[PDB]
Amino acid sequence: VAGGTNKSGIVRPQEIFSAKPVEAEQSSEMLLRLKNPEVETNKTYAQEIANSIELITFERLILQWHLLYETYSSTKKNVMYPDFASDVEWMTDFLENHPLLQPPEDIANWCIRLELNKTTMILKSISLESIINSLRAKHPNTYIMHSVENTASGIPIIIRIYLRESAFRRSTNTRMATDEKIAVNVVDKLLNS
Amino acid sequence: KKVQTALKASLEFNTFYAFYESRCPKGGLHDFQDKKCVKCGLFTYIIYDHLSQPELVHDYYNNYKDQYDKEKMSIRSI
Amino acid sequence: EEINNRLLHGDIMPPIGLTTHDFYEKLQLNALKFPDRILKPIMNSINP
Amino acid sequence: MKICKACSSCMVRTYVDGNIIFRCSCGESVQGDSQNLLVSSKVYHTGEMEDKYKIFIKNAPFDPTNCQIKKDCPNCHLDYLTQICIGSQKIIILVCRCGYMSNRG
Ligand SMILES: [Zn+2]
Ligand SMILES: [Zn+2]
Ligand SMILES: [Zn+2]
């Protein structure tokens, strides 16, 4: 009866007889057969492929997120949120560790601060490097900074995503959206990646 | 006494190899070619067998043990 | 009981896609089923 | 939020030329310096955070309906502890009436 596998008193017959769309199916399933007949003989090969195809959206790896009205310049000391002013310590390390990922010249006054759930990163076996590539491959209109992947408990992993000015140049002719509205729309896109 | 000691050892090995069945210590999931992972030294015929070739079970486990220990402690907190 | 002991020491690591609560419940349901041996005392008490 | 000095009302926040400006219904306008740079935030897994159960974990040793366990308390050397299992990951915490609490908290 649990969500996603609801096969309780008549639901599935109602999904068939009423011709309910896929969006209204509470017990939809699907069977996939491996392309290589040799691979389907081995359980471990089928086990890792099964875990390969499992929707892990970027939202479920997040414990909490903060939307900040900040711009980042390497030299100029811009204003920063007092509760997150300690983030600058690992920002300097990121700048000296990536001589090719320099901050752009069109960074907007909008910052998204992310605190990754390290427990979910362990159970789902998701590395920090994999998350960075996935977000940078899907969102070219953002600049992303991250802390160091730490193996010591008590120190979190921080993802910082800076919105570029082109994020609003996408569609700002529709003036019925203040810059706060687009930024909230962007973070919804980032979390659902 | 022998039964409980052997059960402790076997259960510890089973838990370790069930955690690192698809999970790879080097991050992500296992990349298996030639029956062996490329990121680590895991073999296919060791995940579900710890008796036929004990030495190869006592090496892989000896490689990522404390690692495994830190992750186990981290999950059981907060 | 020994599944609970594994829980106390934090020795229950769920697989990918399962929470510890859901994996613990799965282990308990499997461990609390009568074996096929249950009819051995039943059939010894009856004359077919 | 920003509370107006004059009338103690909830001021409306807008954004002008790279700055956060609060304007009130009484005409008073101020600009936040550092503590108002928080547009929005959300916290996930609110049903199993440590701040959720602080009161409950504190009261657990005195609640007679909690499950006990035969283990020695390392502080007062009492031979029983109170065992609680919180969260979706089934985190086990042992607590005692003397203030001892496993996980070092
Ligand atoms: Zn591997
Ligand atoms: Zn006012
Ligand atoms: Zn005590």
Side-chain angles (χ1 to χ4, degrees):
Chain A
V1 67
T5 61
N6 191 1
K7 290 178 184 177
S8 69
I10 301 299
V11 174
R12 183 53 181 160
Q14 279 294 135
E15 296 177 7
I16 302 161
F17 298 153
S18 301
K20 286 183 180 181
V22 57
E23 298 91 11
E25 288 174 354
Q26 312 185 15
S27 53
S28 64
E29 293 179 353
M30 182 177 71
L31 185 77
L32 305 172
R33 283 180 56 78
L34 308 172
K35 193 182 293 183
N36 200 7
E38 279 78 2
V39 170
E40 81 182 359
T41 302
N42 192 305
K43 178 162 67 177
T44 72
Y45 292 165
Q47 183 62 256
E48 64 96 10
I49 292 167
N51 292 324
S52 167
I53 47 172
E54 174 182 349
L55 183 62
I56 309 298
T57 55
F58 182 53
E59 175 176 0
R60 65 182 294 165
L61 302 176
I62 300 305
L63 260 182
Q64 59 194 355
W65 60 265
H66 294 274
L67 179 52
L68 312 172
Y69 193 79
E70 301 178 1
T71 315
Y72 185 76
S73 296
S74 66
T75 61
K76 294 187 286 184
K77 291 174 70 175
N78 290 318
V79 73
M80 186 179 288
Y81 200 71
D83 307 345
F84 303 142
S86 177
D87 283 11
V88 66
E89 291 177 353
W90 58 260
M91 293 179 184
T92 298
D93 285 336
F94 186 79
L95 289 184
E96 62 87 20
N97 283 323
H98 296 84
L100 277 297
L101 284 162
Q102 298 304 317
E105 287 189 353
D106 53 353
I107 297 169
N109 290 317
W110 296 97
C111 172
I112 294 168
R113 191 182 185 276
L114 296 172
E115 192 275 331
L116 280 170
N117 193 351
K118 295 167 83 171
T119 295
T120 309
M121 293 177 70
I122 291 170
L123 289 180
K124 306 294 181 183
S125 185
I126 297 169
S127 64
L128 184 58
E129 190 276 332
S130 295
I131 306 171
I132 301 299
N133 295 338
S134 178
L135 291 172
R136 283 172 179 164
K138 288 194 170 245
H139 300 279
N141 296 277
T142 60
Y143 165 67
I144 295 171
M145 294 178 71
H146 62 89
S147 65
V148 65
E149 45 276 15
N150 189 359
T151 67
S153 296
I155 305 169
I157 296 172
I158 311 299
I159 301 298
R160 193 170 278 253
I161 299 168
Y162 283 119
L163 309 187
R164 322 220 293 186
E165 183 66 26
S166 178
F168 316 93
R169 291 304 98 76
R170 295 179 66 250
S171 66
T172 185
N173 65 75
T174 303
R175 295 292 300 274
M176 284 73 74
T178 59
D179 288 324
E180 190 276 332
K181 297 295 289 183
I182 296 90
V184 166
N185 277 343
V186 171
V187 66
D188 291 331
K189 276 157 59 181
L190 267 290
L191 293 182
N192 289 151
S193 58
Chain B
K1 176 72 177 69
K2 291 177 70 68
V3 168
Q4 65 183 357
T5 295
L7 167 62
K8 189 172 180 178
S10 178
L11 188 152
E12 206 275 332
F13 273 108
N14 288 325
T15 313
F16 177 83
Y17 277 91
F19 194 74
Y20 289 146
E21 173 186 353
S22 294
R23 285 186 270 257
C24 196
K26 299 287 106 178
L29 308 175
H30 284 298
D31 191 3
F32 276 135
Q33 66 182 357
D34 279 287
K35 300 298 293 295
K36 184 177 180 180
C37 185
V38 298
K39 299 194 280 288
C40 63
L42 183 60
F43 286 96
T44 307
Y45 41 90
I46 302 175
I47 305 170
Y48 300 100
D49 193 349
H50 315 103
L51 278 297
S52 178
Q53 297 183 1
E55 182 65 26
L56 291 179
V57 185
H58 286 89
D59 291 331
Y60 185 87
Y61 178 99
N62 275 328
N63 293 330
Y64 317 92
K65 180 184 179 303
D66 303 358
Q67 173 182 1
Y68 175 71
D69 281 338
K70 292 175 173 62
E71 295 190 2
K72 183 158 68 75
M73 295 296 172
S74 176
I75 296 162
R76 296 294 86 193
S77 66
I78 208 65
Chain C
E1 183 177 2
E2 284 212 345
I3 295 174
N4 292 329
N5 286 327
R6 289 200 280 129
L7 175 74
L8 265 47
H9 308 311
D11 306 337
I12 296 170
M13 294 297 103
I16 305 172
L18 275 172
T19 61
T20 306
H21 169 78
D22 283 343
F23 184 59
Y24 168 83
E25 294 293 328
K26 183 183 83 172
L27 291 175
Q28 287 289 330
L29 285 167
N30 189 336
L32 296 169
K33 293 187 287 185
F34 282 167
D36 285 355
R37 293 183 292 113
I38 196 63
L39 279 173
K40 180 180 183 297
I42 287 176
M43 294 299 291
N44 290 318
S45 303
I46 75 173
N47 189 1
Chain D
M1 66 182 180
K2 182 75 78 172
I3 285 298
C4 185
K5 160 44 63 182
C7 62
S8 296
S9 295
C10 179
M11 294 177 71
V12 181
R13 167 196 277 166
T14 77
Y15 308 122
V16 305
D17 62 22
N19 274 312
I20 289 180
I21 192 67
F22 298 94
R23 198 177 297 114
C24 188
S25 179
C26 70
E28 174 76 33
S29 72
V30 66
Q31 53 182 354
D33 195 3
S34 292
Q35 282 189 353
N36 316 103
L37 297 158
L38 191 61
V39 180
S40 73
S41 66
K42 185 176 180 180
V43 164
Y44 294 105
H45 308 104
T46 50
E48 63 185 4
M49 41 181 204
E50 191 275 331
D51 287 325
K52 181 178 178 179
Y53 294 109
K54 185 178 184 293
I55 292 172
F56 171 75
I57 292 174
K58 182 253 295 177
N59 277 314
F62 305 107
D63 188 15
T65 74
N66 279 318
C67 183
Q68 310 285 314
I69 188 177
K70 181 62 67 68
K71 291 177 70 68
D72 306 89
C73 178
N75 280 136
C76 63
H77 303 289
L78 210 61
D79 62 357
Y80 55 94
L81 285 174
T82 301
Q83 170 257 336
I84 62 175
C85 181
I86 60 167
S88 178
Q89 297 296 321
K90 291 183 79 69
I91 298 300
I92 302 287
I93 305 169
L94 307 179
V95 298
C96 177
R97 68 180 65 252
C98 69
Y100 172 72
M101 186 182 97
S102 296
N103 83 359
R104 203 180 177 267

